[model samples]
Target: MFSAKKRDKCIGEMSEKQLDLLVIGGGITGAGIALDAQVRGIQTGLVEMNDFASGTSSRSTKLVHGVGKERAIVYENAPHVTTPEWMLLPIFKRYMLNEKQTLEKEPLLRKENLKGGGIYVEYRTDDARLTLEIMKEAVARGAVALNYMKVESFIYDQGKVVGVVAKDRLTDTTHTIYAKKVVNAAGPWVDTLREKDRSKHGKYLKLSKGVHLVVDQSRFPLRQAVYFDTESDGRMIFAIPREGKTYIGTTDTFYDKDIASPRMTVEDRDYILAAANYMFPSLRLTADDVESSWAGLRPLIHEDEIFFSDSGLISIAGGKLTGYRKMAERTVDAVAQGLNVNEPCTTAAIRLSGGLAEGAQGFPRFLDEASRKGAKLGFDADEVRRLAKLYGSNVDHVLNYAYEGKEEAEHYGLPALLLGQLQYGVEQEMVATPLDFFVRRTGALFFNISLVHQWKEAVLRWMAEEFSWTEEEKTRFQNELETELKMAVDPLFQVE
Candidate 1:
């Protein structure tokens, strides 16, 4: 979990020594740089102002693929070696597999919806979870991962980059970190760093806001992951399957507002709902059906005077989740050259941890394994398969923590997620609070509200023990969690 104590320890360690590479963000791009730099034996430390993937990474539409024509355009125009190999195939395969498995898991789509129109792709995990996993792997490989630490500014000496001055949000302590090189992979917030040295990235980073709306699958029975040009605006819309629910939207519009907290506006909601309604008229989804909604800004490179131009700071914006690896590869290649480090980029072939093996066997057999495991734990086959698909090869790590005996499992009902699994998230996955576990980690809060309500007290009690939370803290966390859940269903609520 993202504990203040752990974050303070990280801050203390960071204050002790200078790093070779100081990454100033904890989003996907910054996580990629930290991973890339660390794997290449560069001493790295990444600082996030908030939780990992709490920004655009979490707010994304959750589509992971490289089927869009816009990406193809990026491949053609970009000078930083954005080729086909670096652009498409891998992401396509990833997203395609994701789509297939999601559809397989939920056959309700076939009975209710159309096949496909646009070039839809698959994915391995939702962007937020995937980014967290990547950051964890990077930390495991020796990079210092510092969350709740904001980079106040950079340390520049004689017109050369050195390090950053970061502040610990929890402890209210400020410290300077001296580093040999600083990679400004702050996504939309890169401008703050660029202001320190305008010559490095002058007039770059076109900040375009993208919003996504998640709705219940019961209202939108998307059979296959539908991909098509939006009839309302001609912009692309992706209806991806997640758990038993469906996540939709991705309205790309220009936004000029506070970079710290980007909120989903009424215009954004109406645009997405209109686009969705235009596509799936049968669903009759209104604003009331929205489960949760979030908005994020893209730090695109600005070429012309247009509001949505790309920024020159190795910008990779308006990109899908699947293309993150390729984007990282390109960005790191430029970083490598900039730093005069001569190492061939190998991220292309470097399969992400828990990514399905190349030429993997049948999904049925995988589902069978999940069923067998589920039966052992007294869970229905569907629940087990959902866990298996979501966790991939790491499903065992999640399932092993299920209730000890069949009696306890039987008592929990269908989709029997054990308290131990929640504990594992708290202990291992940096799930600091109950909302982190339910909303971000498992997404159970939104997908199964009944289950959340059923186990809310037990889950919070377990969290209190695992995280060493005070009773007051537990109450506050529970109140906030419930408030957030309520606001998820109604975005116009004051709580949001």
Candidate 2:
């Protein structure tokens, strides 16, 4: 089992050696590149200014497949162009055909439907957890992953790409990392870095900020994922089911401000709320219905004529979550050509650790085997399946941590996840703070704020024990959790 100490040691060992690849951002694109390059036998390292998926990666609509009517139209117009399977395997056709069914499945779609818009076929999952799982796979395949390290500037020898000078945010120390190739997968903030050397890579990214709000599932229950066009702005919207809550919102407006603290403005919130209220008129949701909200910027490729790429940085902007794999494949192919490496990308066929068959199937079997061995856990087959789906093949690792000698399973007030799973997230999933476990690792903070408040102390105690946090760390975590709680209740709290 990987521990925090080991992860820290790995970062401390990084030196100024000229590596084959040095990826700047730790978002999906950067994580994907690190995994792809490492798997293809390249020395690679990645640096993140914050935690993994701390940026737009965690703040997303969290849909897995392309589900809007426009997306369906694109699929029909060009079937080969649309790759829904890239994000999810099981595709739902009925959900796409019927607007009401799609709305019932996805609350956001219901809202869009009220505005004469309906969604198609799309799957949703926890974005932060998914990104963590991807990072874990990349690290397992021999990629040096560093968090809390910000890239101060790039290391340019003469003119061609070389390495980067990064500041360790934890220790307040700066170090230079030499590398042969550098990939700017910095999402919306890539332009800031690109401006440093405009002659080589000039003005290649278009910044578009996206915001999403989470509401309690009980107040706004959903059956499946939904997508639809908004009448007010004529933009796309998603209502996705995750954990026990439904996520909605996502206003795509251009912003020119600090990228780190992009909060949802009042105008944006009102627009989204109006749209949501329009869709579900029966169960009207006011601004107070919002539990937690977040925003992230999209890095789009600049277009000279509003069509093709106009620069050399190879900008990959404005895409869905499902298309990340393909985006990485395309990005790596460009990097390979740029670096003169004749390696064929293999990420498409390479199933993620959770998606692997052996690991995926064995988890439930382990629980069943444990139950048959006189362990009287109350987790049913349906619950087991749900847990397996959420954790991929890592479900056993969590179940083992929660299962005592022969005790009944601890309740989490839901049919999908158990107390053991929550405990496992803290112990195994690199959960350092309460917000890390509730808001990021699990979707509990979004779905049920009351439940989060109820279990906050238990979770804190679990973290204190598992992570060996000092009293100071515990207090800091509690304070941070309270601040996040305040922010969750009001989207405008963080907005300037």
Give Cα distance to truth, residue 279, candidate 1, Å.
3.5
lDDT by candidate, in order shown: 0.62, 0.61
User: Candidate 2's residue-wise lDDT over 289-316, tens digit each?
Assistant: 7777777777666531111122233434
lDDT of 1 at 255: 68
Number of clashes in every candidate structure? Answer: 17, 6
Question: Highest TM-score, which number?
Answer: 2
For each of the candidates, the C-alpha root-mean-square deviation to the true structure, in angstroms, is: 7.8, 6.8
lDDT of 1 by residue, 1-496 (tens): 2333365566667677767777777887778777777777677888888777877777766544454653443222211112122111111213333445544533333323343222333432466676776776677777887776787766667666666787876456888887766666666776666665453343566677877677877788765566545654646776665556677758777866778666667887888888777655666778878867666777666641111112223333434355665566666666666666767665444434344443134444765776787667666667777666666555676677665423444544422366546645655566666767776676666566666778787677766665577777788888878886665566566743
User: How big is the positional error of residue 298 in model 2, measured in Å on the Cα after superposition?
Assistant: 2.3
Q: Where does the lowest 10-residue lDDT sum fall in candidate 2?
A: 86-95
Alpha-carbon runs more than 4 Å astray in model 2: 16-18, 66-120, 196-201, 223-233, 301-320, 358-385, 403-429, 461-475, 492-496
